[PDB]
């Protein structure tokens, strides 16, 4: 998947498509919009291909990673979703939304202590009051 | 070959026994500790080809890249290592070091602050605070 592509690219250290600026930002923006058009219409398989394409070109982009993580969560591929949400958090250290979703994934993966840790981080550190309520509702059930 | 075509790791198919993999990891660390950086790099690349999802294998390769002053390449792997491990902030600490070397002090500060705020590793937090104390 996207993560193995990122690791392989790092192992090989060769020039990537991003290193040579193979696709301009404006075209990448257009493809992202097309990807979400597919998603919004229920064409989840095509949206997944487009998000995979974006994550091959520019893996270290929070917007691309979050879109793919959400698709995996919808598809109940909870470990892949959790791994990508964690990448998104590392890329965007001040948004606890991916931490909240990681917690949901961990609960579905039968890892309630990991889930609890995720939800507690939201409560302690997020300034999104609505996200905090949602995190607390999961904590109340754990 | 089937794993190449299906994206599965060599670890997934048990291509090398577990104890032999332990030995290879220990030999990689031995090269690293002895300053045999070229050999350590070969060995950590070998390990990461074998199991791209092994956090410690990735951390070894990232450390090599950081020692070699390939700071962006190190930071990229550290982000993966962090994500696969979920709750180990050591890769975030090293990313902060890389960002300082890349002349991105605001990014580094965010890394060290995240370590302070989330890590339960008191020795790691002490190191992170020492970097924060120095950031202008
Ligand atoms: C493609 C897709 C599909 C669905 C159901 N959600 C998303 N995303 C993207 C995103 C970015 C930042 C914060 C949250 C989210 C989020 N839920 N993306
Ligand atoms: Cl658990
Ligand atoms: Cl995990
Ligand atoms: Cl900066
Ligand atoms: Mg749009
Ligand atoms: Mg074992």
Curated annotation (Swiss-Prot), chain B:
<keyword id="KW-0963">Cytoplasm</keyword>
<dbReference type="GO" id="GO:0042802">
    <property type="term" value="F:identical protein binding"/>
</dbReference>
<protein>
    <recommendedName>
        <fullName>Chaperone protein IpgC</fullName>
    </recommendedName>
</protein>
<keyword id="KW-0843">Virulence</keyword>
<dbReference type="InterPro" id="IPR005415">
    <property type="entry name" value="T3SS_Ca_resp_chp_LcrH/SycD"/>
</dbReference>
<keyword id="KW-0614">Plasmid</keyword>
<keyword id="KW-0143">Chaperone</keyword>
<comment type="function">
    <text>Assists the correct folding of nascent IpaB. Once it is bound to IpaB, it binds to IpaC and impedes their premature association that would lead to their degradation in the absence of IpcG.</text>
</comment>
<dbReference type="InterPro" id="IPR011716">
    <property type="entry name" value="TPR-3"/>
</dbReference>
<comment type="similarity">
    <text>Belongs to the LcrH/SycD chaperone family.</text>
</comment>
<dbReference type="Pfam" id="PF07720">
    <property type="entry name" value="TPR_3"/>
</dbReference>
<dbReference type="GO" id="GO:0005737">
    <property type="term" value="C:cytoplasm"/>
</dbReference>
<dbReference type="InterPro" id="IPR016379">
    <property type="entry name" value="T3SS_Ca_resp_chp_LcrH/SycD_sub"/>
</dbReference>
<dbReference type="InterPro" id="IPR011990">
    <property type="entry name" value="TPR-like_helical_dom_sf"/>
</dbReference>
